[PDB]
Symmetry: C5
Subunit: 204 residues, 5 copies
């Protein structure tokens, strides 16, 4: 594991090639979780922020951006979308959390909570995933669509297996996150594929 503290992955161009493979020992199905990260991009079109597929399952867990001020979350091919007021272009800090028992999906854009939506109550996101950054999988680790490619910068990615409380969300947002157990920026296990440069985080 590498400590990417103070740095970010910069996907410099539109392609159906460049991407990063995040590696995690997720052996037991996900029931609860929280995902946080920063992104900076001036793309007007829709693009995938975080793709997570398992065998035979497309969009098992996908954080997709529809257009400005509109974020979508997919849980087992199901989808919820919540709106927010935001400038364009501008850096963003996203934290999305889901909880099987209630099915309640909760977005936190820049330390601000959006309206709660619910989906797939009592479902379990399948274990042993293929997590890619920069592209949107339509297969287990592949079948990328160019019009869904993310071009910009991504940093400070953390994923916990629990549903973080407001205090913990804001801390992450403020730069002092709790240690993550599913994916941690300070001990990341990745695989750079294609054209993707690592540079320091200058916009925070």
């Amino acid at each position: 594991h590498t400590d990417l503290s103070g740095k970010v992955f910069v996907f410099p161009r539109e392609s159906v090639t460049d991407h990063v493979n995040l590696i995690t020992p997720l052996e037991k199905p996900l029931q609860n979780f929280t995902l946080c990260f920063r992104a900076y991009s001036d793309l007007s079109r829709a693009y995938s922020l975080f793709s997570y597929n398992t065998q035979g399952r497309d969009n098992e867990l996908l954080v997709y951006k529809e257009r400005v001020g509109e974020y979508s979350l997919y849980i087992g091919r199901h989808k919820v979308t919540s709106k927010v007021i935001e400038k364009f272009p501008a850096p963003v800090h996203i934290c999305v959390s889901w909880e099987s028992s209630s099915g309640i999906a909760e977005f936190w854009i820049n330390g601000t909570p959006l309206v709660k939506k619910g989906l797939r109550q009592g479902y379990f996101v399948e274990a042993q995933p293929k997590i890619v950054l920069g592209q949107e999988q339509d297969s287990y680790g592949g079948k990328f669509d160019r019009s869904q490619s993310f071009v910009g910068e991504i940093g400070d990615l953390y994923m916990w297996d629990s549903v973080l409380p407001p205090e913990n969300i804001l801390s992450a947002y403020q730069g002092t996150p709790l240690p993550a157990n599913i994916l941690d920026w300070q001990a990341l296990n990745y695989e750079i594929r294609g054209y993707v440069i690592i540079k320091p985080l200058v916009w925070v």
Copy 2:
């Protein structure tokens, strides 16, 4: 009689099913009243905020939202609408009050008074009502329309039988409301029907 303090009812999806039944011993006709509550929703369409029907009377008392910055009040099937400047989406604090003698309906969005309008002077809203949250009744407790369904969060609901003065409105708005006698959030009598979760109020 449950204390929903620090919590809110979250209606997570559009449906013609989910709703909450508020129960109150209103056995003697309403002549004066004040209703206050918070709501957070990113729905662009129209939707009912508070439905109150009595036997044989539709829209006896309905707080309906026409569109952004436009609120309506129905008293015995009659209606008044007042405008306000507001952002979208964003949490809101609404207090509406009516007084039979003058017929004056008074809205207070986020501690700000909108222009007064008048309707049904000298009328009495029937007692023994059917009060639902999350749907719009077209019958006594039923006949819901999906296109009027409320999806988002609701909290801090209080209803007094008198017409509250400015200082009492602002207190409610500020989080220190006067004890209500028709409906009280700190001693609520409800019936969750369908998909509606209870979660803490994080947006205030």
Copy 3:
């Protein structure tokens, strides 16, 4: 005479009926004057703010609102209009003054002077008028047009027979007006006709 201090006339609905008759001992023709009052309405259309007719003379003195940020003044059937930047809806404090010698009409929206315009230099507004609030006269005290009706609230009306200087305008605006001699809110002589309620001024 009645002291309407801290109160306002609220015209709660669109009609060709409701109005208030202001009674003033004006027996000698007007040569100079200043009018001030507050208004709060969310009407989008045009409406009359202050109508003043004399026998045979329509629009002898009329303060009419064309549309948002556009105020008109009629003096003996002649008209001037001046623009201002304003929000909608929102309470307003208006002061308009006219002086026969120069013909200079001067508007002051919310303590802010608009551009001066000129009309009817050397004219005298007839005395022994018919002053109505809430409707637009097309005859001596009558012939109301529904599409010109004012619906909203009006308060703090004062009318002097002289042309007030800036410091006196701002005082009125700040709530400490000079005693008026043609019409005074603290000693008003009115006649309510139709549906018009008196309530306290909550929006100032």
Copy 4:
């Protein structure tokens, strides 16, 4: 020799008649100069701010306003236009300067310098001019066009025969101008013709 300090000329109506003739003490051809004044108008159309014609030459020196946020300067029938961000309606403080050697025209709207433009390098603006305020000359002191008439208020006019430095521009803007030698508000030689009133400057 009149001191118009603290006052302004108010042109109260659209006409092809009202105007003021400025008479200047200096009889030399112009090579360098600086002009400053305040204006307040809510006219949406184009209109002439300051007209200066000499026998046989139209638009020898003309400060014309094309539309909102767009100011033009004519030197010997030649023209330059520069843009600025501005509200409408709102009072303005304009200072324009030209210098024959370089041909550099320099505008300063509300103490803010616009982009420099250049015209008629090495030209000399004729002497024995006809300077009118409120109309746009198409002949020596005449041939006014109604659609170019200025209606609103003008005050604090000063004109030097040199090109004033930033400090001196800001002083004029702040109300403590350097003594002018071509035209001075505190010792103006004018000739009102038509309907134009003098009133105190209430908007500064």
Copy 5:
């Protein structure tokens, strides 16, 4: 070898003639670099900010402005464009840097970093260039297009052969730049050609 400190080149008009030739002893190919400068223009169309051509190669290094809030960078005929929120018209401070090893182009508008883009990784911009200001070269020092001509003011130009870090960018922006080795405003070697005046920097 001139010190243009506190001054700027002002291109006063649209032409296919006026321009300035920057002279630099670049005999060895560029691999890394940083360019910074201020510009003030109210041109709505596209225009070239900085043209750099070598023998045989067009657009070897060109900083071109597409439209408002949209900046392009060309490296060896290849192009990247990045967006930013900005007012119009308004002065701007631009710093663009490129690094052959990664191919990462980095823009900094008014001390604010835009999203990184990448082009020509492992390329070397040819040495012994023809650098013009005010026009866009389509040949070695010539073939200007009128529709790409820059009209406005440019100042504080500096160009280093290294990729400056955030601190050094902000210093340049704040007026205390590091000494440049490829092009230095305080020791500039230029050649004015056509109508271009030098004046002091009044807008900073």
